[PDB]
Amino acid sequence: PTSDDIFEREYKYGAHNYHPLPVALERGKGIYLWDVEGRKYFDFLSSYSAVNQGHCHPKIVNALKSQVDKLTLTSRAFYNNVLGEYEEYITKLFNYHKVLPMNTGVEAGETACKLARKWGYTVKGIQKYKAKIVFAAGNFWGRTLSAISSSTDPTSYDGFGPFMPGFDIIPYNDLPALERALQDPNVAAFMVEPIQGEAGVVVPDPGYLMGVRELCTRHQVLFIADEIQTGLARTGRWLAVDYENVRPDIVLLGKALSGGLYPVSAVLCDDDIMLTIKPGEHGSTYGGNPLGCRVAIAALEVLEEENLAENADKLGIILRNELMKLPSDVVTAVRGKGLLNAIVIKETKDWDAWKVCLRLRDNGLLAKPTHGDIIRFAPPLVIKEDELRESIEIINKTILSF
Amino acid sequence: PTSDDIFEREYKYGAHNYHPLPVALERGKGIYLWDVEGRKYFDFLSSYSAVNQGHCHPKIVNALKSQVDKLTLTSRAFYNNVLGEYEEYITKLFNYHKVLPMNTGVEAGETACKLARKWGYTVKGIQKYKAKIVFAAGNFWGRTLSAISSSTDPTSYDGFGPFMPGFDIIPYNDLPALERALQDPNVAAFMVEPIQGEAGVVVPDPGYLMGVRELCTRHQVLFIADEIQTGLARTGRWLAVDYENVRPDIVLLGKALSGGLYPVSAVLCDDDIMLTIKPGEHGSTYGGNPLGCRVAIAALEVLEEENLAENADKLGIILRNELMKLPSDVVTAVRGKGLLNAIVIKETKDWDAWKVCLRLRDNGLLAKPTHGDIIRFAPPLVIKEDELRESIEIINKTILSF
Ligand SMILES: Cc1ncc(COP(=O)(O)O)c(/C=N/[C@H]2C[C@@H](C(=O)O)C[C@H]2C(=C(F)F)C(F)(F)F)c1O
Ligand SMILES: Cc1ncc(COP(=O)(O)O)c(/C=N/[C@H]2C[C@@H](C(=O)O)C[C@H]2C(=C(F)F)C(F)(F)F)c1O
Ligand SMILES: O=C(O)CNC(CO)(CO)CO
Ligand SMILES: O=C(O)CNC(CO)(CO)CO
């Protein structure tokens, strides 16, 4: 069963909601992936930063295999013995009172919106159903009707309305706009990514996150930080907001929370917010199941025990330093923090980010474009400096082969 | 670490969005669960019908263990070698052109709403953003802002607005109301459960589903059948709609699609609907990952090879027959199809569905109430007639001990 067979068969029987890069992967471990013909590749996408810990990390695998022989799902109608241990661990690890477990990133975001609105009505005293949540243009937090309603990307929302009311949108990295938006006492929260991933790794100016926290406190507005892709060592800290010593009111985690072995996500906040939701008022069939909790506990331990945040910090400097050695004729910008990085391609009609990624694949490195001029470079955080330097050679050899 | 310790620790560190039955489960297999003190129980909830195949079915476990050592997540940016095999299998199994894989039940529902609206705008010709979707009162399809906006249950939606526009609600099991609702040419779809699970196992009159299909065809409206809990042999057929030989335009699957080992869900429909969504316009980080696909393929094979639908059919008759032998003084109604069943309790102030389930737990059987007068009985479909008869004894011994 060849790569071409694999492409054709997905095309026949599967929805066309994606156009993947033409590579048919069968196997992966650490920083490497192998296709069906056995060719070996560096993974510079990390499955959108879900395999921070490397593919099939043995510690997380063994947690999965130990638990799958015991108990995988009771539903939340009864207690299991794993969920709390995970809850005690993750809430102490991040220093919040409580966690609400969900499965996917967008589910954690919907949860955060529901906490914000409920807190707005039952604590802040907003009249029912006047609550607003402010978002930054360029945000991406998933594909539900609610998530695309806050998007400014036409490919997310066009053809899918009517849209959820009560969302306001302001420019990203703009504190005067946030100050103007928070004049409305019916605003309950501001939700924002510490670095906008899908918008093309857009890093806000130093002090932005400190100013956000100040404005939210001053106006009695919840600061929701979406760390589903910036968190868990990807940017060189436990949370990207740690760079400015800022404590959000709600933190969203996902992707790397499981090492890529299970959809696990989390909403962290204190009691005065979390307990606004009463029993029966929110949940999920698979949220908090024992199998995902065991996996999450191990995937957090791997991040801590192997010191991947400081590894991501020190190697990201190296990565960005080498990438700017590329000629400004061809690479117009280098952006990133820790091991979440991007380069912008001077998109002539000679060439584009898609053709670059095709040739990168030919030379053994997997990455993928985000707007035809942007290419993300985000390898697993278990990569070593010598392995990283080999990868930079493949990027050099590719960019300069045009 | 005792059951009481387990309760207290979840209470301290976890959100209070649930009030589970006081039982702390550590282990499960087949139809049985064991708590931390070793006591053994019949599972008559099946984790809300996600473990149709029994807890930790060895065939599904071995599929998980084989794949977790190989590759668990590439993201949809590249191809993996498993996804298509699953897509070919499930689309031929249910006789639709295509499948769109997602993770949770509510994600499949949001997907169905987005397909319906997109089809309404790009095929039916509804002006943008006038599309409507009709739902039946009592529906439950999840906890996103969109899903609670169609709910008529105040505990789902109260305090969580403002709500998604464009949803109409009609009585369930009411064909004249549907005919009245579909007079609006801007309606794109009607979404409905063949049996309303969360509303208390509410079974519509014979012919209802045939009348729905006729009205939807006559008015050029998509018939979306939510089988996330009625499907996959739970009611005695592959799809609950199979009882009336009705083919919906969109079918939603979830829960049992994985055997309870992984959150896997699916949206099935033909090309003229499915291909309204173009690349980049919908997706999910974990949807379609190789690990969940291997698990789903095995969990479907277990349903087919062990003939659980006919087993569920023949044992559900037995179950409902015995349950009506209970005195009408105390059990006001018995409802269900296949192995999805409920009894209604004459809720005096002497006693209620919660106290019944407490005493059922004391006598070794796990079930749980849904509105304080309704108790669901839904054991795994691998149960045997002799095991089922033992369980009925525990239900008899409990109801008559009051
Ligand atoms: C900050 C943030 N909050 C929530 C979610 C929802 O999480 P989810 O519901 O998917 O679990 C996401 C998900 N982002 C995805 C979805 C995935 C895909 O489209 O396949 C590609 C991906 C992505 C990343 F991560 F950067 C990119 F390409 F869009 F740019 C997210 O980035
Ligand atoms: C027909 C249908 N369509 C979609 C979904 C969403 O699927 P999901 O997003 O959860 O994967 C569901 C989920 N129903 C759940 C959620 C779970 C919980 O509240 O913990 C209890 C449960 C339930 C069942 F199954 F009957 C009950 F108690 F609400 F009555 C569903 O029934
Ligand atoms: O009307 C618009 O332009 C947009 N309105 C919303 C976003 O601001 C929904 O998309 C309001 O929630
Ligand atoms: O206004 C209402 O009573 C309800 N409106 C909606 C449901 O019909 C949203 O909850 C419209 O989508």
| DSSP letters spanning B61-121 | HHHHHHHHTT-S---TTEEESSHHHHHHHHHHHHT-SEEEEESSHHHHHHHHHHHHHHHII
Domain count, chain A: 2
Atom of ligand 3 nearest to the CA of A168: 8
Amino acid type, A224: I
Select from B17, B261, B274 the Cβ nearest to the Cβ of A279.
Answer: B17
Three-state SS at B314: helix
> Would you state the structure tokens that stand for residue B336, as one six-digit string?
């269900």
Answer with the one of B269, B289, B306 that is the final residue of a domain: B306
Answer with the one of A282, A306, A330 that is the final residue of a domain: A306
Q: How many CA atoms lie within 13 A of B179 on its CB side?
A: 6
Kindly give, in sequence order, each residue whose CB lies less than 8 Å from that of residue B128, ignoring residues fewer than 6 positions away. A159, A161, B121
Q: Are A150 and A168 in contact (CB under 8 A)?
A: no
Helix axes B308-324, B290-305, angle to 10 degrees: 70
Residue whose C-alpha is closest to residue A259's, from A52, A42, A29: A52
The dihedral sign for the CA sequence B61, B65, B70, B71? positive
Judging by DSSP bridges, how do beta strands B340-345 and B374-377 pair with one another? antiparallel
Kindly give, in sequence order, each residue whose CB lies less than 8 Å from that of residue B142, ignoring residues fewer than 6 positions away. A284, B104, B105, B106, B109, B110
Both A238 and A172 in a single domain?
yes
Helix axes A58-68, A290-305, angle to 10 degrees: 160
Judging by DSSP bridges, how do beta strands A40-43 and A365-366 pair with one another? parallel
> Would you state the structure tokens that stand for residue B96, as one six-digit string?
């639709």
Q: Are A146 and A163 in contact (CB under 8 A)?
A: no
Both B279 and B327 in a single domain?
no
Q: Are B302 and B374 in contact (CB under 8 A)?
A: no
Amino acid type, A233: A
Both A42 and A18 in a single domain?
yes
> Would you state the structure tokens that stand for residue B256, as one six-digit string?
């049992």
A262 touches chain B (CB under 8 A): yes
Both A266 and A374 in a single domain?
no
- Window B:289-348, CB contacts with A under 8 Å: 291
Helix axes B58-68, B290-305, angle to 10 degrees: 160
CA of B200 from ligand 3 middle (Å) equals 37
Both B345 and B399 in a single domain?
yes
Q: Considering only CA atoms, give the Rg of chain B.
A: 21
Q: Considering only CA atoms, give the Rg of chain A.
A: 21
Residue whose tokens read 């479907």 = B300
How many residue pairs bridge chain A and chain B with CB atoms within 8 Å of each other?
A: 378
What ligand is nearest to the CA atom of residue A197? Answer: 1
A135 is catalytic: no
CA A4 to CA A62: how far, in whole Å? 34
Answer with the one of A306, A325, A355 that is the final residue of a domain: A306
Residues shown for chain A = 402
Q: Are B63 and B71 in contact (CB under 8 A)?
A: no
CA B37 to CA B39: how far, in whole Å? 6
Both A43 and A69 in a single domain?
no
Contacts of B45 in chain A (CB under 8 A): 75, 77-78
Three-state SS at B375: strand
| Strands, sheet with A32-35, edge to edge from the N-terminal-most edge strand | A365-366, A40-43, A32-35, A21-29, B78-80
> Would you state the structure tokens that stand for residue A18, as one six-digit string?
């994606």
Helix axes A83-94, A290-305, angle to 10 degrees: 30
Both B271 and B384 in a single domain?
no
Both A317 and A289 in a single domain?
no
Exposure string for B32-47, b = 16+ CB within 10 A, e = fewer: bbbbbeeeebbbbbbb
Both A240 and A333 in a single domain?
no
Q: Are A356 and A22 in contact (CB under 8 A)?
A: no
List residues bridging with A30 in a β-sheet: A55
Domain with A363 in it: 1-56+307-402
Judging by DSSP bridges, how do beta strands A265-269 and A365-366 pair with one another? unpaired
| Strands, sheet with A98-102, edge to edge from the N-terminal-most edge strand | A98-102, A265-269, A250-253, A222-226, A187-192, A132-136, A167-170
What is the phi/psi pair of residue B300, to 5°?
Answer: -70, -45
**CA A221 → CA A33, A217, A230, B56, B151, distances in Å?**
44, 6, 22, 45, 28
Give the single-character DSSP code of B221: -
Residue whose C-alpha is closest to residue A193's, from A35, A24, A340: A340
Alpha carbon B159 to its chain centroid, in Å, reads 25
Amino acid type, A364: G
Mutate to test the interface with A, among B42, B60, B73 (most CBs of A within 10 A): B73
Residue whose C-alpha is closest to residue A74's, from A62, A66, A82: A82
Residue whose C-alpha is closest to residue B278's, from A26, A156, A389: A156
Determination technique for this PDB entry? Answer: X-ray
CA B13 to CA B34: how far, in whole Å? 24
Residue whose tokens read 């060719």 = A39
A226 is catalytic: yes
Select from B71, B91, B130 the Cβ nearest to the Cβ of A28.
Answer: B71
| Three state DSSP letters for chain A | CCHHHHHHHHHHHECCCCCCEEEEEEEEEECEEEECCCCEEEECCHHHHCCCCCECCHHHHHHHHHHHCCCCCCCCCEEECCHHHHHHHHHHHHCCCEEEEECCHHHHHHHHHHHHHHHHHHHHCCCCCCCEEEEECCCCCCCCHHHHHHCCCHHHHCCCCCCCCCEEEECCCCHHHHHHHCCCCCEEEEEECCCECCCCCECCCCCHHHHHHHHHHHCCCEEEEECCCCCCCCCCCCCHHHHHCCCCCEEEECHHHHCCCCCCEEEEECHHHHCCCCCCCCCCCCCCCHHHHHHHHHHHHHHHHCCHHHHHHHHHHHHHHHHHCCCCCCEEEEEEECCEEEEEECCCCCCCHHHHHHHHHHCCEECCECCCCEEEECCCCCCCHHHHHHHHHHHHHHHCCC
> Would you state the structure tokens that stand for residue B332, as one six-digit string?
């006001």
Burial class (CB in 10 A: 0-12, 13-18, 19+), B173: middle
> Would you state the structure tokens that stand for residue B281, as one six-digit string?
């316009």
Both A290 and A327 in a single domain?
no
Contacts of B101 in chain A (CB under 8 A): 14
- CB of B146 shorter than 6 A to ligand 4: no
**CA B72 → CA A25, A61, A261, B63, B253, distances in Å?**
11, 10, 6, 12, 21
Both B127 and B237 in a single domain?
yes
Both A186 and A72 in a single domain?
yes
Q: Are B53 and B382 in contact (CB under 8 A)?
A: yes
> Would you state the structure tokens that stand for residue B92, as one six-digit string?
């031929």
Helix axes A353-362, A385-399, angle to 10 degrees: 120
CA A175 to CA B348: how far, in whole Å? 59
Burial class (CB in 10 A: 0-12, 13-18, 19+), A301: middle
Amino acid type, A200: G
